[PDB]
Structure 1
């Protein structure tokens, strides 16, 4: 049974639901619960407990209880005083996000849905990866309200649908990274296709190689058009940043930079 009191629903992940709750054993503090059924790292939202709800004839209600940081990088970036988020801090946050995302790869884990709304920024700007499945489904340009379930951080791979590898996250870290400076998403897709294009519009159509044969939308459909300069949308981004950014925001997953290595890149000098 749970001591943690479900204070509110906050998302429905595949495995089940996730609410906000107050862990009554501690200060009535806030804690994320993920109620499951069946049949550490500093930058990762900790798992306070696994409460077993019901052992049965094959099926077991559990209730994982994860730590909670009440503020996403989204409200973080939304919040900062007008010039923007300070530069020192990005390198750090950015740095943290990586070290964390790295820690997951190191143990077979692929986050896949690594949107800012899953990145948590603590009171002390200490970052923690987490997933809520909540789905903050969007509407477009004021008078052009097109719906979408925010798939802006989706990798081209997963977009075209031909994988969901370790490097899928890394593409996201890049989107998020660009966004740090940004405080406006780099690629706001509506459909899975729109997004696939947008990325290319910025990055540019890779040669028929990085882009597979079988996979959904054919390379040629998104006609070579463009090779837009990063600086055009990630202003005031220093050299090594412009660097590591593209290294994460690269089309071919195997070619795209790794988490582990990303930590080592010059940028975090």
Structure 2
């Protein structure tokens, strides 16, 4: 189970080879193994350009399942740290957001929730094309949605919150909220978006609202003033507490801020 990596000189095809062993001594292949791998196989029927493509799946007769994945070297963190000293230009940030959202909207549309999006999981080709990876095969809390920090239910809106955090990080180039535990990271969020009201709080949950002091929402230009007015509004619709009011990926791709102007 050592991860391997190879490039093909005749076409530049870059591969990675993940291998996972499964038990399977009674009822053959496990249910999860056969479901999770098949879900990955369904995705590549569409060959989406913003998600890493799976190549083959080799099984071995005490069962080893080896997945040959598309491999790119740079992740978003490396891309961000290599930016021009002033930072990424606006049109580049918009282009990265668009592809990011396209890929995420593809996964959500196929009932896949990333649930752990961080700049280390977002990968960028040398040609400036982002591909999402690490999903549907089975820490830092800086990017987890507040409904996850509260051990409540997840759904696909968890990924849109993560997008909000990464959206602002491309401007700040230091992360948005960096907390030490679940309770405190929740606090740093409320110091920006304000402590949510009463009935906007989830019910069956791990921390009551009384665990947090009254706090009003400070402006968003407080945090990312490198960003135009419309981009500020779009960020808030991602950094919206209630997951049912939070913007979707598809709706974000239609926001005026990401509309390519030619």
Report the counterpart of residue 39 of structure 2 in structure 1: none
1:82 and 2:85 are equivalent in the alignment: yes
TM-score by length of 2: 0.83
Contiguous gaps of at least 5 residues in structure 2: 23-28, 31-46
Distance 1:238 1:52, change over 3 A: same
RMSD: 2.1
Instruction: Say which of 55, 64, 69 aligns to 1:66.
Output: 69
TM-score by length of 1: 0.81
Structure 1 residue 32: Cα displacement:
2.8
C-alpha deviations, 1:203-252, integer Å up to 9, x for none? 11110122213201111211121311111111221122111111111111
Report the counterpart of residue 167 of structure 1 in structure 2: 157
1:225 and 2:215 are equivalent in the alignment: yes
Structure 2 contact 99–130 (Cα < 8 Å) conserved = yes
Report the counterpart of residue 43 of structure 1 in structure 2: 50
Pairing of 1:19-34 with structure 2 (within 5 A): 19-22=3-6, 30-34=14-18
Structure 2 contact 75–123 (Cα < 8 Å) conserved = yes
C-alpha deviations, 1:19-63, integer Å up to 9, x for none? 342267977964233323352211001112211133x6xxx4211
Matched residues in 2 for 1:132 and 1:261: separation? 22
Instruction: Say which of 170, 191, 197 aligns to 1:201.
Output: 191
Q: Would you say how many aligned residue pairs link Structure 1 and Structure 2?
A: 234
Structure 2 contact 8–14 (Cα < 8 Å) conserved = no
Instruction: Give the 3-state SS of the residue equivalent to 1:198 in structure 2.
Output: helix
Instruction: Say which of 250, 254, 258 aligns to 1:268.
Output: 258
Matched residues in 1 for 2:10 and 2:51: separation? 20
Matched residues in 1 for 2:57 and 2:248: separation? 31
C-alpha deviations, 1:3-31, integer Å up to 9, x for none? xxx8xx5xxxxxxxxx3422679779642
Report the counterpart of residue 12 of structure 1 in structure 2: none
Structure 1 segments of 4 or more deviating over 3 A?
Answer: 23-30
C-alpha deviations, 1:63-102, integer Å up to 9, x for none? 1111111011111111112100111011110111001100
C-alpha deviations, 1:160-209, integer Å up to 9, x for none? 01112111001001100011111100011111112111111111111012
Matched residues in 1 for 2:186 and 2:163: separation? 17
Instruction: Say which of 76, 97, 119 aligns to 1:116.
Output: 119
Matched residues in 1 for 2:60 and 2:9: separation? 17
1:94 and 2:101 are equivalent in the alignment: no
1:236 and 2:226 are equivalent in the alignment: yes
C-alpha deviations, 1:83-125, integer Å up to 9, x for none? 0011101111011100110000101110001111000111111
Contiguous gaps of at least 5 residues in structure 1: 1-5, 10-18, 134-148
Of stretches 152-161 and 212-221 in structure 1, the one that deviates more from structure 2 is 212-221
